Amino acid sequence: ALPQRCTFAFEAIDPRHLAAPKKLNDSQRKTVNSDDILSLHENYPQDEINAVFNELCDPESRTQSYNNQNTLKEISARRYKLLTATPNSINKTTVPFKESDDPSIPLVI
Amino acid sequence: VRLKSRYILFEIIFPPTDTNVEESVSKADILLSHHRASPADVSIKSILQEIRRSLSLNLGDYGSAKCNSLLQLKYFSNKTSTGIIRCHREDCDLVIMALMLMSKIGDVDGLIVNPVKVSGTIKKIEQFAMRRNSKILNIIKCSQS
Amino acid sequence: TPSDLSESGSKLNVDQFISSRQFEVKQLQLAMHNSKAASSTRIFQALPRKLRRRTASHNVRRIPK
Amino acid sequence: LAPIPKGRVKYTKRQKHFAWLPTHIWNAKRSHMMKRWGYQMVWAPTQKCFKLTHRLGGDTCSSDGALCMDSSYIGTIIVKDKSNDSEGDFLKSIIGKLTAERANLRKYRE
Amino acid sequence: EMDNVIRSLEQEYRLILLLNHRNKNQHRAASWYGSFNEMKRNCGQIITLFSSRRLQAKRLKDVEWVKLHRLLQRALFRQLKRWYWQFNGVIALGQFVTLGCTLVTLLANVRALYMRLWEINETEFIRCGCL
Amino acid sequence: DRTQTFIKDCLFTKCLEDPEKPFNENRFQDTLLLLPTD
Amino acid sequence: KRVTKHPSLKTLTHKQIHTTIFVKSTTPYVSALKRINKFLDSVHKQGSSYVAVLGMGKAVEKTLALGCHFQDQKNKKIEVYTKTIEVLDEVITEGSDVEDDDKETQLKKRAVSGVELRIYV
RNA sequence: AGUCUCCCACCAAUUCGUAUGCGGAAAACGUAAUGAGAUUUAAAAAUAAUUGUUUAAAUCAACUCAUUAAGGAGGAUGCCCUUGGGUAUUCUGCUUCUUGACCUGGUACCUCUAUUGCAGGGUACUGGUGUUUUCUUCGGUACUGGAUUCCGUUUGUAUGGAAUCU
Numbered sequence A: 001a002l003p004q005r006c007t008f009a010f011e012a013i014d015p016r017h018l019a020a021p022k023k024l025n026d027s028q029r030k031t032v033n034s035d036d037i038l039s040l041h042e043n044y045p046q047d048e049i050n051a052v053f054n055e056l057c058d059p060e061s062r063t064q065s066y067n068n069q070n071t072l073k074e075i076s077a078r079r080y081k082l083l084t085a086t087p088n089s090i091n092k093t094t095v096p097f098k099e100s101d102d103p104s105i106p107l108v109i
Numbered sequence B: 001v002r003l004k005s006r007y008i009l010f011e012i013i014f015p016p017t018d019t020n021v022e023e024s025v026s027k028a029d030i031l032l033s034h035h036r037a038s039p040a041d042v043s044i045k046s047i048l049q050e051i052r053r054s055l056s057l058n059l060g061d062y063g064s065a066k067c068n069s070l071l072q073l074k075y076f077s078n079k080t081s082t083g084i085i086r087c088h089r090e091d092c093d094l095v096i097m098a099l100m101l102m103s104k105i106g107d108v109d110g111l112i113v114n115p116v117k118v119s120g121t122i123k124k125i126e127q128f129a130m131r132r133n134s135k136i137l138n139i140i141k142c143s144q145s
Numbered sequence C: 001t002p003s004d005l006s007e008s009g010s011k012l013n014v015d016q017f018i019s020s021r022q023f024e025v026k027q028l029q030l031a032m033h034n035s036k037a038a039s040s041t042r043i044f045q046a047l048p049r050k051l052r053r054r055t056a057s058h059n060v061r062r063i064p065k
Numbered sequence D: 001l002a003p004i005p006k007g008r009v010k011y012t013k014r015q016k017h018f019a020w021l022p023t024h025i026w027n028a029k030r031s032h033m034m035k036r037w038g039y040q041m042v043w044a045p046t047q048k049c050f051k052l053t054h055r056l057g058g059d060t061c062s063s064d065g066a067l068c069m070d071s072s073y074i075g076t077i078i079v080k081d082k083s084n085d086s087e088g089d090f091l092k093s094i095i096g097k098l099t100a101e102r103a104n105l106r107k108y109r110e
Numbered sequence E: 001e002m003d004n005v006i007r008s009l010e011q012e013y014r015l016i017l018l019l020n021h022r023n024k025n026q027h028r029a030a031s032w033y034g035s036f037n038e039m040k041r042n043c044g045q046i047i048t049l050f051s052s053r054r055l056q057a058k059r060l061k062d063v064e065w066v067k068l069h070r071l072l073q074r075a076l077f078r079q080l081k082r083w084y085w086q087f088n089g090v091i092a093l094g095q096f097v098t099l100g101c102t103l104v105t106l107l108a109n110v111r112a113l114y115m116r117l118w119e120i121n122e123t124e125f126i127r128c129g130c131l
Numbered sequence F: 001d002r003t004q005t006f007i008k009d010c011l012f013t014k015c016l017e018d019p020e021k022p023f024n025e026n027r028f029q030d031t032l033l034l035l036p037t038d
Numbered sequence G: 001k002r003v004t005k006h007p008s009l010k011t012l013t014h015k016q017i018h019t020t021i022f023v024k025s026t027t028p029y030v031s032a033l034k035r036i037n038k039f040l041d042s043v044h045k046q047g048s049s050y051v052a053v054l055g056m057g058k059a060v061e062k063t064l065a066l067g068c069h070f071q072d073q074k075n076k077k078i079e080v081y082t083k084t085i086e087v088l089d090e091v092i093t094e095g096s097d098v099e100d101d102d103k104e105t106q107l108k109k110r111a112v113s114g115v116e117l118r119i120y121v
Numbered sequence H: 001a002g003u004c005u006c007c008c009a010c011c012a013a014u015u016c017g018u019a020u021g022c023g024g025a026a027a028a029c030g031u032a033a034u035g036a037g038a039u040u041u042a043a044a045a046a047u048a049a050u051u052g053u054u055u056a057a058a059u060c061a062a063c064u065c066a067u068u069a070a071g072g073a074g075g076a077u078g079c080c081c082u083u084g085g086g087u088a089u090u091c092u093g094c095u096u097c098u099u100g101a102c103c104u105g106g107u108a109c110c111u112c113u114a115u116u117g118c119a120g121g122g123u124a125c126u127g128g129u130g131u132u133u134u135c136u137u138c139g140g141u142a143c144u145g146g147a148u149u150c151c152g153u154u155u156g157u158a159u160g161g162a163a164u165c166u
Helices: A034-040 A046-057 A059-064 A072-081 B027-034 B044-058 B092-100 B122-144 C014-020 C023-032 D009-015 D024-030 D050-057 D089-098 E002-023 E031-055 E062-093 E098-128 F003-015 G029-046 G057-073
Strands: A009-012 A105-108 B005-013 B072-077 B082-088 B112-119 C003-005 C010-013 D031-035 D040-045 G003-005 G020-022 G051-056 G078-091 G106-119
Touching: A009 A046, A034 G078, A034 G106, A046 A059, A046 A105, B005 B092, B005 B122, B027 B122, B044 B072, B044 B082, B044 B092, B082 B092, B082 B122, B092 B112, B112 B122, C010 C014, C010 E002, C014 E098, C014 F003, C023 E062, C023 E098, D024 D031, D024 D040, E002 E031, E002 E098, E031 E062, E031 E098, E062 E098, E062 F003, E098 F003, G020 G029, G029 G051, G029 G057, G051 G057, G057 G078, G057 G106
Parallel strands: G020 G051
Antiparallel strands: A009 A105, B005 B082, B005 B112, B072 B082, C003 C010, D031 D040, G003 G078, G051 G106, G078 G106
């Protein structure tokens, strides 16, 4: 049903960052008509996708992606220290993202 | 190397042998007049003895000895007149011919033995029996209108 | 205690293990199933052959020569 | 030509002819292996999936699942023009020579 | 009050560790074994939490309540049902039933002490800073 | 030892389809050893 | 003018697809009967109530035929609903010997009438 | 077919971090060059699996065990060939580099328990067999079936929290 032109590229988080494969929000499933697919051919963020492509092509950013590749023990320690957070009302099994001590990974689809 | 068994499904059908009474011509009417009921004097050892007598009378001595080694009636109830007899795969045709050559019961006369399904497993036999019982209800529901 | 000592090791007895803990099992079964606890049919399904695995040995391993 | 990477000396010493995918051990423990063209790819998983791939990945509608293929063996070249700060008039002719002018069109460019 | 529940829980943790050490090599590749390992790790975490509470010579810690309530909502509500379903499926299979029944009984008994301490210290939970 | 046997029979009638088989084919071990194999 | 037609958007969650037969224009009659019987038997173990039978365009006639077959043959309640289906068509707009497949594309919506046919047990 | 073995979740590492003749993810797995051996032996018999006979014991053939780490360069010998080049064997010798058996004590620095001596953890260094006689599993993380509903959001995170039934 989708058209030929469909390429979605962005910077994703580490796959080991997630604990369980949680599904995305599924509440607008019924209200999916042809207008959205018609607008998909118009609305397209060329700039960010091109930036991700240039980051993947350039060998300097591709190496910087390996800046701080945390180990399974470090991820387990982060999951264990998040057991005691400041909001003492909700259980979080995942781990938050950091703008300094975390590697940005570029994907292409 | 492996004992191959084969079960035979047979049914007792009573034809409406009455020339003084006119009959209705349709599907479910003749299905009901042919599947009326089995008489009270009906059992497993009474049908096995009758079929053994018939087999010994039609085939002979060795013809009955070769088939009577694994000739047993596994499941049969007189409410619907459907029975499952176990036999070998070598003498299955002989058992079918004996069922065909069944003349009458010692006390009950005028009946036909019809072999419907034959296979080497009881699960498929039960499945086919359930399918036939479900199919029977359709014409009944249609004719009750 | 449901377990016992021996000259060889420490062994576990299933009989007292489940006989002492019966009301807990009843409470668990009523907490899992509420309407089918009074019924008696087959609830749990057989394991798919895709998920079925095989059993290994009880030894550690064998080193190469 | 870029050479083999530096993983584990033990496993790196094994191949010596055919490179290894980053999921070699996993697939080798799941699927069968073979070496045809300077590389080691998978042939087929242990469990038979003739009718499974048909109902899952095929053009059928009853597809409740997904199939993942390790396509790391497909080699790629990234080509860029450094001769000028402008459009790829050189890559235009390069692609028109390599492939048919089907590739060198307005659609695949814009 | 806490002493009896903690003694019973760690005593059954002994049997958990023993049966795991026994049946490791036989069923390293299994789903019921993985559920058993996860349950053993959670039980060890809770038991070492309560031991840290105990040897401190007096029952007061603030992070203890928080992480105990974190693990309590994980062990009781979510992980329990899949554990029970797998433990009953592996015994419905018919390959290994004599230890599957013991596994089911062990889960049934470790759930009761968990909910017991839950209903005992719910008052402490609503007392300190939440609920 | 009647009652716990009846209870585990009611336990097998939920998982298994014929509950009286493991006792006849001797599939319910009364004892299970816990010792490193020597 | 060259114009191609893609299928219509199908958003099925997990089970609406299972108990639903999409009748094509080339789908045989007996195969449809067989798959409908399989769906009817498997519904209450899937956990649904009815079996959806969806067809649009040329297959509407034989879809209604399948419906009225099981209506009186097996004496099962049927429900017919008339719906609209929007389909996207990719057309070439005019604006070098180039293949017609690789050309500029424009999307256009087209509405068609269709029949949904639910069968009870 | 067979009471044989192993894979069918990961783990810059208490997780066989095993560059060890070759191939191989593993295998109580295949094969290659040399030497030796027969209850007088490393071990088979006349005081884990399998097979009716169940290796050998003039020579051959078959079984078991004991050695040979990957790639590049120089010299010598043998063959086609006699500018030269190719193959096989043998000696010198370099390149192939993740600050890791485990564990105890002392010293030096930093953080929490909301001043300190002291109590616990991490890292850098030195010294030692130190009762590591449980010579067979004992480390960490992971809700993997389906349906629906409630709530917060440009003040912060662009998505998160929890609930009912099978």
